[PDB]
């Protein structure tokens, strides 16, 4: 275990000897690079320790596969979990730098996008920390999604450049690479097994990222696959010929798999690439797992032991191919027969949902998947047939309607025939979500109410057939990154009033703040802390949004994928209402009615999704005018933070007073931002749905602001729109007209209101009930103004959010996965 | 300065902490990787030392630009020059490995091809060793030329894979990258200077490879440029659209510059790429140099000082663009006017000619170059005009014919007009060799007789105008790589019979072997050593050529570009003659007359060059039959070594008895293989030309086997063929018929002999006088048989070759460059 003295040397060493810059000066990016290399060294000691202990013990290991990991930045949580925070700070002093400066150089790992990505990253922290043998498998996306620029003209995209110099935290494993095949033909050989020959051949090379646990040695792995083709494949004859672009083809169409995350699938080309990406992950991962299982088994190898040595968690329907791919490996390659392979598959694999609505579930073209993964469609089919037979045996051909209905609901293959049937152009499709719910031994939703839908609607029939499979694993977020490290002031207070530093682990200790929520001394330190955080954010918003703002206003934050269902538009409209009102009142009354706010927006809109980009533009103009109005001044600001990601969240969240989770009700499965917020003492306005429902229950009904129509009514209210019974509120009408008047200027918005107006239509009719929720919304916002004025009350609510957030530690989530699905036990590393 | 104890730790560290493999086992490639990382560390100490001393002193630095660097393997010369050879050996013991094993894992740096490449690498060794402030600039070719496979069907190409895992010896410098532009337009701005806007934009990122000097700290650099485009440029809109291959375009056509060396220029596309490669090097290099000059200058900066602080050596006509490119930087960017810029340019830049014949000299399409490099053709033109004016001022308008002739010979622009002229469709071309001979202050050839041609033929008229410019710098090769490290047995003997280990530096000490060339004791140790070396080669030829051979035969080596001018088939034909003869005589008589031989062939043929590939096939079949003939057995073997490169040379050369340098006379400028051979105690058969002429003079006329028509006669003898006077030797006729008979079997040869036969024609007529030299050749080969039998005589000759090779140390060459062209002095590093 080192100290500042030793680390100063560790960094000097790496700067000189593991260099990526010239020796001219020790600038900031040099300093970061060398610092991170130092940290790795430490991480690799513990990584190899964990590897050894895991090898010897050959215990059950678990495997979280995710199309996205939103790792964020590594340094601060790294030296935090290694407890060397102090030492690195002091080390850098000696070398003419400081920690925060250096931490600033590090780009977020653009390995993910949203909550499903973050949930993965949050889970890893929990697993390492809790000493559970588990790894994460993902793709190594070179250019992420995009770097968001907020130009005068709204949002614009650029390729993320986080790998320009390369990531210091990663370890390439040139001996870990697997073969991945696409297209081709299948032929049965004289052993009676299938052989999948021909098509395309690419390699998947492993890059390990060490995840360290807090106050433990357990250092697990995020193994990231990266695709290429062996240099053999470079076509010399063609290159020398003159066909350079031709000569590249194999490498071009191999690397492209790992270029970007969620590549636009309007083209067939894009759908192909998407599928490539899913399979690559499922394949290269399972092959690595299987490899490791064998190694650890030795001479004495038994495939009955595989599910007792391995569990695979499919994060959504993207990893679905794990089911047929494992089948494929167990049968075609390892030799086992259908029953053995299938039994093992189910015992191993499990599905985590993440999606509410049935049309949000991933489906594929049968013809497409057939062309790309012949062998896999074969197996899929066999499973579907297996299934029709299950569905028929249980039930039987009573009430043909019952039977027939069930068949179409549950079948994996949409628009297909039955191998035999009784009873006395449609595009052929493959339902990945069905495959998952049959292939896995466990299906779970991500919050009470989410897991309820899946049970009683989305997979209703599968609940009937296999009730045992359905459970729930309410989401969480890591206390380390989201309290201890993102918000040190908060931490000092917590540690104090609890009496140990142990809440970081034993986070049920937050509840011990309840008896002190009224204590005025505690409220003082609380406000002082929040403020402190806010003062940091001021400087941030200055450099990033070029708008100067005041600490002493309320911080009202909404940060999520920009989307009509997320309804940032409802929020900005509530902003515009307050603005219209404030103009219609003199200076003095203006200051009396509305509490000062800084309204923070952020998050990305998919480049193709026009309305969403229109929303980004809207907000940016609202802010343009409002923030440059001598008449308003500092009573209202509206900023949009460019390129929202983990770094930003780590900064805004600690300093938030109010945060908005105002999705149309019944649509959000869970959400995880809202947990980070409640943890950081923030108060939540939102609809009743997803995690919001539990957070409210835990924090306190009166310490969480609620509004809007509830999930069950929505169809009622849309029906109301469809018939023409929704009478809009006059305040709603006001806002729209006020904008039309061109208050925000030369950009015309008729399109944007366009979406909301009319009773019928694809794009018309306000599917997401902005107009309908709007009244209770703004009135709720009045109750926040009101609450904020009563700072003794406000601050109590703040403290109660934190003291209620404990259940939302991902540590609780992982224990539950680990005990109830994976049956993995903790391995302690000496 | 470390020891085995410390290095064991250094390697353990790197294997674990700078890893590129998983922690599972310490295999060979792991062991090599970690070992090399260790060595780097040492190299970087001394690299940074050299950098500091150079910075402070800001003395004249020199710069060797080469389209190719044939670095080979680094490890053995690295730990050799650092004198840590012992320590690394012992270190590896402790870790369950041995040095040679580990050295075997390292691929040769595929950064070059031929002698001009090797000469560069050899020069670097000399410069570091002799403490001269100089660097090397080259491109970082990802896939080299090709990996040569010698299949049943002859030679076949594969892309070199030396960067699959990446090179441990390189240091990326992410802060060292320059902008390179192609195409575009030029417009004059309001400052009166030219502005080269638009076209293509790519980055050139530096990779440093440390060259350590023997028994010094001076550690210089081979800075290798590597091209790419900033991740910004990745077209998201297009990728998400579906046009993946489109989205890549910029990166594809940026990286392609550094894909392969000498990419086939049959296509226009290929010519474009070739030019791109030359410019990239000239530009990115000069920008780095200029940058460094400025840095070192500080506030007090004077461009008159530039040529007194810098010299640029253009290795052949590939770096020609350095002249206009420096002009461009000095004028358009830095602001200086024509005269200042030009004077500096000439003072800085110098040309080394590596080419005999005038049509072997590099020319370009005017239209091509003035689409890609507009600004550069402008400057070129200005220089040519400057030149016409020079040519006219010296030489009055007296002899019109004289004047007009001269104009067309010396002008840079072939098939152009004169800005005004007196006197009372041809494709427009640009002559890079002329540009070089005008732009530089120094032109030099690579051997006496080569430099004589350039003076008195190729640049005859330029000799008249600027005699001072012409000198000679006879080639050399490094004693370190080519005696001390490739051949340790030889070294032990040398060190012994000389007083000291100092010959490695003070290599004139080899001459001390002359007294003692007769000494029988020395001859014993000599033969013992040679043999030892040969025993290594036996095992090598076994694994790579799959032919078992005996040490006790004579080793007859020919290894060079496979080419009709290099002959090769004269030798293989001389091989076939001996074979035909041996069959026509009984076992017993056969074993007199012919001494046992192993005839080694090797080297690559360009994939397009059909005849050359036909030659590779020929040899491989000759060997096929001969080596599988119970009747011959071990009196004759013929092998072709696949993938001849530095590693191989290092192995064959020490173990050679005879080596062949039998190019058609007057064609070889120099050659460098023949110097490494004479150094290693080998005896040379060859034609009178290139370095052969000096080697013979130095080693001793009677210790070098000579034959063939001499350089002056060739045109005589070709004229003789053209008229039909040649009259072939009956022995020549024999061989051809014997092969025709299909002795070597099912592959039909005709068309191979096809080249040699006939008196007129493109492919006919034996341009290279195989048939004509053949008689003296084979008869000379008889004199080798004869000499080899007299082992006292033979071995004396062997020893005299070594004792004569001293003048051929590249150390002598570099001193000469350094004193006579560069005016650089040695800087000692404390
Ligand atoms: O469960 C992880 C996340 O996945 C989805 O994208 C949902 O929108 C959200 O409800 C949830 O937080
Ligand atoms: O000098 C460098 C080398 O360049 C060329 O490859 C010539 O063939 C050779 O004569 C010379 O040794």
Structure commentary:
Two copies of one chain form a homodimer. The first copy, chain A, is globular and about 90 Å long. Chain A has 830 residues and is an alpha/beta fold. Chain A folds into three domains: 1-57 and 74-107, no CATH class; 58-72 and 108-476 and 809-830, Rossmann fold; 534-790, Rossmann fold (3-Layer(aba) Sandwich), CATH 3.40.50.2000. In chain A, the strands form five sheets. The first copy, chain A, has a nine-stranded mixed beta sheet, with helices on both faces. In chain A, strands 19-18-17-20-21-22 form a six-stranded parallel beta sheet, with helices on both faces. A three-stranded antiparallel beta sheet of chain A has the order 12-14-13. In chain A, helix 21 packs across helix 28. The two termini of chain A are 14 Å apart. The longest helix of chain A is centred in the first third of the chain and has 30 residues, at 28-57. Chain A has 32 helices and 22 strands. Helices cover 48% and strands 14% of the residues of chain A. At the A-B interface, helix 2, strand 5, helix 7, helix 8 and helix 9 of A face helix 2, strand 5, helix 7, helix 8 and helix 9 of B. The complex binds alpha-D-glucopyranose (2 copies). Chains A, B: InterPro entries: Glycg_phsphrylas, Glyco_trans_35, Pyridoxal_P_attach_site. Chains A, B: This is Alpha-1,4 glucan phosphorylase L-1 isozyme, chloroplastic/amyloplastic. Chains A, B: Pfam families: Phosphorylase. Chains A, B: Its cofactor is pyridoxal 5'-phosphate.
